[PDB]
Amino acid sequence: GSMKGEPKVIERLNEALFLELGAVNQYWLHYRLLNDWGYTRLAKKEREESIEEMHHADKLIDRIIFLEGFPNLQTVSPLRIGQNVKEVLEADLKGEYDARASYKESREICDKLGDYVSKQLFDELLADEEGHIDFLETQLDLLAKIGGERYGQLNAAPADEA
């Protein structure tokens, strides 16, 4: 018996890790920019989401090592950095769709190759990303309906607690 994973499974896991490290760093930078712009409420959520992506990355790393593969943390996927509140949300949403599409294909490859526990891991990440797509599309819907300046005000703190 051996836990040596399928090379294609470890590749999909590393591709997920590539995207996850990009998302961690994009959310963390969006956090710092949003805070510097005054949108301290959205910034706090952005930092929470960076941390959620760190947990995803950690689960992927752990699974690759268990499959006796080598996790690649040397590179991170292309960042999309926004220059105003709406661009930040739109950039996050595009990265979420990239993750969604990647994990859907990955769960299918793991299933086809008989690695059902890795398949399960991609199924859990897929559900998590769809939840965050929910959130981001809701925020962009709200921003369109009440307008960007009111959306920014709603997500800014007053000066005595900024």
Site for Na ion in 25-84 (CB under 5 A): 53, 56
Which of a second copy, Na ion, none does residue 53 bind to, with CB < 5 to 8 Å depending on kind? Na ion
87 is in an annotated binding site: no
- Is residue 130 annotated as involved in ligand binding? no
Instruction: Give the 3-state secondary structure of residue 54.
Output: helix
The rounded distance, in Å, linking the Cα atoms of 63 and 33 is 33
Decide: residue 38, CB within 10 A, 0-12 exposed, 13-18 middle, 19+ buried.
middle
Contact positions with Na ion (CB under 5 A) in 3-22: none
Residue at shortest CB range from Na ion: 56
- Dump the DSSP string for 3-20: ----HHHHHHHHHHHHHH
Which pair of structure tokens corresponds to residue 149? 């300046």
Measured from the CB atom, is 83 or 149 closer to Na ion? 149
55 is in an annotated binding site: no
**Residue 82 binding target from a second copy, Na ion, none, CB below 5 to 8 Å by type:** none
CA–CA dist 140, 110 (Å, integer): 34
Residues contributing to the annotated binding site for heme b: 54
> Which stretches of the chain bind Na ion, using CB under 5 A?
53, 56
